[PDB]
Symmetry: D2
Amino acid sequence: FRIAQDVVARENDRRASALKEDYEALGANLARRGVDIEAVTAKVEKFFVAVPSWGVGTGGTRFARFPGTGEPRGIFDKLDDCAVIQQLTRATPNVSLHIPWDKADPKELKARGDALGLGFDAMNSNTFSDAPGQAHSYKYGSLSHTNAATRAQAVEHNLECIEIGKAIGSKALTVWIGDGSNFPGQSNFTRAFERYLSAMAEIYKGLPDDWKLFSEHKMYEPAFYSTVVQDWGTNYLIAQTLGPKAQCLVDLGHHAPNTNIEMIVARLIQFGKLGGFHFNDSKYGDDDLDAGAIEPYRLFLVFNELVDAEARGVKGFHPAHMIDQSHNVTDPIESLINSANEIRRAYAQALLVDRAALSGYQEDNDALMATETLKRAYRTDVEPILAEARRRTGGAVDPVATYRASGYRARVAAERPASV
Amino acid sequence: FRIAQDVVARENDRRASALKEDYEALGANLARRGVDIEAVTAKVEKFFVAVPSWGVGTGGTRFARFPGTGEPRGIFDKLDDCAVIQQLTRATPNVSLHIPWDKADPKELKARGDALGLGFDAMNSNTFSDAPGQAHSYKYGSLSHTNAATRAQAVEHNLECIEIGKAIGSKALTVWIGDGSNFPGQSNFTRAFERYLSAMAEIYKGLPDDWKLFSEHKMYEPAFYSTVVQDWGTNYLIAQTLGPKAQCLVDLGHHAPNTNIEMIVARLIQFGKLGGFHFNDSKYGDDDLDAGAIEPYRLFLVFNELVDAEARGVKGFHPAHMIDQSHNVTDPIESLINSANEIRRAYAQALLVDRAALSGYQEDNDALMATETLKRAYRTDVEPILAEARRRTGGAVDPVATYRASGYRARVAAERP
Amino acid sequence: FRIAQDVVARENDRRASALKEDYEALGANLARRGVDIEAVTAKVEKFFVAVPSWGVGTGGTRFARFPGTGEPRGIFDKLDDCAVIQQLTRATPNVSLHIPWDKADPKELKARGDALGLGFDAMNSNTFSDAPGQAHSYKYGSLSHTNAATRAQAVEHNLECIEIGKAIGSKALTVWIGDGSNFPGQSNFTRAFERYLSAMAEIYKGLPDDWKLFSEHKMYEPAFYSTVVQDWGTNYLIAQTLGPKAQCLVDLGHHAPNTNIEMIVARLIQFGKLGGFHFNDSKYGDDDLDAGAIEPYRLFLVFNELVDAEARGVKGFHPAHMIDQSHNVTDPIESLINSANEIRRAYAQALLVDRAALSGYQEDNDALMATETLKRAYRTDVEPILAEARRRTGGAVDPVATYRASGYRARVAAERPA
Amino acid sequence: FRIAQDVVARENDRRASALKEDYEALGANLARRGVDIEAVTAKVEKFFVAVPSWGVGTGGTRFARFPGTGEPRGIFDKLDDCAVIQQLTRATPNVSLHIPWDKADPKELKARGDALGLGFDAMNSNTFSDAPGQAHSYKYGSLSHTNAATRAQAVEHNLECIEIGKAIGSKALTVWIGDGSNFPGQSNFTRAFERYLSAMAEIYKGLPDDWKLFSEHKMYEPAFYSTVVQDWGTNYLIAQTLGPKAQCLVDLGHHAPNTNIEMIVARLIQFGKLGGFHFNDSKYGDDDLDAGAIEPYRLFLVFNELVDAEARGVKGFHPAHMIDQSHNVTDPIESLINSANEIRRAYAQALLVDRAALSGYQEDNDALMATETLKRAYRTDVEPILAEARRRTGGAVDPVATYRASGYRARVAAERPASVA
Ligand SMILES: [Co+2]
Ligand SMILES: [Co+2]
Ligand SMILES: [Co+2]
Ligand SMILES: [Co+2]
Ligand SMILES: [Co+2]
Ligand SMILES: [Co+2]
Ligand SMILES: [Co+2]
Ligand SMILES: [Co+2]
């Protein structure tokens, strides 16, 4: 146990009385509304989101990186930190690895995961940066590079990711690349996309029968003029071209200003190409901030579309959700904990929406009551539900407060030497 | 009473039991947080926001307008409908008039106002459209038009708005114009602004000493290349140049994409030039949608700055808040009702912020706990306080439900073409 | 001759000398560049773009409309005005009609266009506004409205547009609706889209073998929260679903801030769904400003994709281009004239691009020389070519000057109601 | 000379003929327009823009940095590369230094500059990153940090930049900081700004009589929720508050999407607070791309405002312009060369605007002709002027071509060790 059980128990006991009061009060309010609080809690305690191994370390910008104390040394230190997030929130049982950053003997990775009670989610390839001893640079691209040798090298790396994933229990490969141009004319849009499609087709060949290949669109950065996989439209063309095993990943902060993101989610679902959603928040661009910290209502609206899919009876809809954030000014462990909480928060709220009433207001074009129907769900403070779900599953009523009480950061700070 | 008191009473009793349960539960939860729910309710029942006379009728776009039934025929019908908003929400006791749309015997206006239990907020001039018999067109601008005669006409119009305002009890004049250009080179940025400043100086000269002159910035529309009063920066220069009685109005949907609007509010407050906030919500441009319907957190963050100004003890801070929305696909009255409700919702939540805790987390640079401190307030469902505040002041526990149960829309539908 | 031939001739001879100088100098410069100026001029004079019948009237905003003098009373006055643009620029041979605004006797329309030297392009349906006596309001939608009867009414209207078009020579129907929602929850995104697809399928069935059905995306307005056909992504799904005769229209001002519009053009072409491009310019949203008045380089880059498509030999690629603008502060005829010119300006510069050189820098990943290769074409002032092309084809060397010299505005102003 | 004179001479001669043809053709067309080409060229050859010392090294993003060959290490390597840009374009005689990156003995800096034919422009402080051994971290801010000792350290560092600048001929300190917040509530907007203003007042006290203090606004990055000096409105408030010696810097890519930047430029000039403009181009955010590579017309429109002010010499108008870009996928030297060219290009075209005619169309509200008046100047291919200006001043007719013909990049690559072969 990364966090002492007695600490968790002690902090839970200290907040038990208030939780009892808030939960029962909420339960009665929900009951008056025709909702069984126990049914919501039961689903909430089963909602999981993958944590990125690269998120437990402090992030930075091109201007600077301000590391905190006890930064994880390698993938093993990262898994140990991810274990804390899962133990306290019980909402992140799976970790998403990034190759070559997390490269290590698959058997050891698996053994560490099992010992910590962590599983492994989608593998993530890396052809947006150069590794040492690399025959060809990705400066001008990878899978869509003009040079065939460079594209084949990118393909082999991705195939390697699949091999590592197969050995640790992963069932998917996420592909996000920086491929694009910074100047008009630098790239022939169409030829670059044709090259990308051919490369991906190669990667697709290496997928096991029960694996998925996820392509992730991004409007810009690292490319500042054009990006090959720039939006969901190109993303759809990709998945539809590759085949049944290919789907699209929607990363919240990867869209143009004012984009109606929840609509994109609904569209991809309608055409069965929503592989998953990558959570984070933003105000300006791909800020990679804590989910829900900037626009909590938008996060709720995305979940409303995810829950409606279930309500409409969409078949075989098992999206792979993951958090993809960069924590530049907070303890990474604490930010991921509260971000996972916000994600469960919005999910619980989407579960509260009176779909019956909603359908009636949509049918009658009663816009005001339709929006108020969503608001009645969203305005509901579901924290007691999230808290109780944690208590029941061995987690903490107040994750961050328990984390701080355990003095975990100080402990790892003393165990881990800062880089020189 | 636009709405029968017996209907109000009925629709309140029907929900009183549930409200009592919710209010008490919240009272206990707030007590555990060291907050007296009674103190919050007392503040909420006193929070008012002006309603735009022109928002009570159905709005439309350049593509089309789809009026509903019982549309107001003029200012008097508009006041009648505004009276419904005030009676049920008790959060909009003052109406903001727009001239010449609402031109009418000032004495008559005041009469109906008093009768309906309404007052008049800031006056709104209109030099972004031409009126009947108007000598010069405002097609190429008004207060900053290249033609002197046009500018003088614009100035005179604003002065007339002041005269009408003084007669009905208004204490401020709001000036928003579309002045700008649609092509590069069309206007000379600096000269157009110089002309605007001089005209506003004339208007300012005709201001009573207990009056204020509000200028309102907008990034674009109707001008699609440049706008004289395009942002708060230009707006500040305007207020600073004109004088102590001149301040800046901040309309939520009037800023560039991703603008940090709450920061703009803070800046203006710090330099004492925040005349008021024009509430509404948006996703794309100046959508003029129901407040909080798109980004309720942003609305709360704006109120966080408003409430912090008080906690910081800022003096003389008494901003003139007003709703400025267009209701294209809903009953204007219901939208205004829920919007005014949302504005009080954000205010109440802001009142819940533990300032001491927040202050400590900011000084120590504990970003996570600092943001969590705001969320603890924001995540609180203050609806019970809003409903109770209304109930205690003669309003409806559920305004829209009561509005619909009264059949008011059907009634005016019969009385109007 | 809507504009006296003596004026045109006079205004041309008055500038003919300077033009020969500029044209001969440019011809020399291009020659030093291995470019035959005559080849460029021959292509330019053949480039056309449809003009919107509703474009010759003064537009406005939700705040106000300031009409000028001599405002057209209807389609016939509009056609008389469109004839002016075509006579002087020789770049707008066809006019795009909008129903019910231009509803009239097909024979009348055709006879007039033939007499004015104008043809008829894509038809435009209108279910984003209510007409007198209309049985069902489009307030909450049309082709995607929740009410079956309302959708049927919208479908019937579109089919009626096809009938009108068949009688006047049109070969395409363009569908742009305001369908969407202003509030979260008001609409169920998927169900609305399904309804839309089903209605469009009914319209598709009524298409002649040689007709095309164009769907046009728009991020927002009149809908301020969500729009059924919000972007090219949804638009592609529509075109692919409907069939071979269904394609996508890209209107420049209809995208999110900072969107790379030229890429959307390349993507739709790659998959054979680029029905056409609707020209205009913008800085904030769907401003509908004169083409190239805000970002002429972007206009150029859009044409770079169009020209590259031809150069690569893309099969069956014949976009249905049209101008879609709102003129709120200028004489509508003059803006359309210069907009059409701005379009040909960008087209001509795109033609000057050394494709082999660009291709080489692209393969070598020489980003600097690649962008410079485009700039060498873009920086070139091709005004002489545009001017010469107009002169040789019966147009005006300086269109707007000739237009103002003819005193046409004052004329129609005296013949039309205030 | 970084580049051999014989190479410059040879490459100029190779293009001399075509240039004469185009220049004469343009001078003729301009003559017919009532414009004397010589009057333009004369001003163009005198238009300079400072080059950032950090601009000659390959840039990167948070995801990666892909260095090219012969990367300059240290300020001396950088000045050597900046010297190339000046020799070939003659538009970048001064270099802007960044402390602590370019920290070195002033006497040696001055000497190396004089030797290369380079002068020194505005000094640039750095409190948006941490230096080794630094007492206080700038993680949560610098000049506006809640910790007093941290602000003091920030202030002392800026004062140190002023001292270095005084020793090498600089007359200004440019201050761009990352100070802001990533989460609502993290910072108290007003208090942070009050702390910032108080700290800047201290720096202001250390300014010589003939020095200027430039503050630079940026909408976001590194801060992703709020930034203390977020826009020109806040920036104006800073300058006005600080005093006559404080002005504002406008960096093209530091504004919200669709912002009308040329208007901001006009407003600052009107109120005498436009300290300078930092050139680069962008499409999505602060992309720091090559000037004019994305929106050349916007660049011209900014210069239309500058040229107008320049003609009618306005009180307080003496801009300290500088290029501030990141070259992630091109030879930094080549990009800076073509960027400086674009800057002069817009300047030249703005110089061709018929102000009398423009003023007329503006007074009559003839929007169509007003915009066309601007376009007639913008559409003019002024390359002949730019190239003739360079040729007359010891530069190269085609700068990049000459740079490539010289083999300079290959030359420095053999002199400077890369990280790997
Ligand atoms: Co992601
Ligand atoms: Co990202
Ligand atoms: Co307003
Ligand atoms: Co507005
Ligand atoms: Co449009
Ligand atoms: Co269009
Ligand atoms: Co800068
Ligand atoms: Co920057």
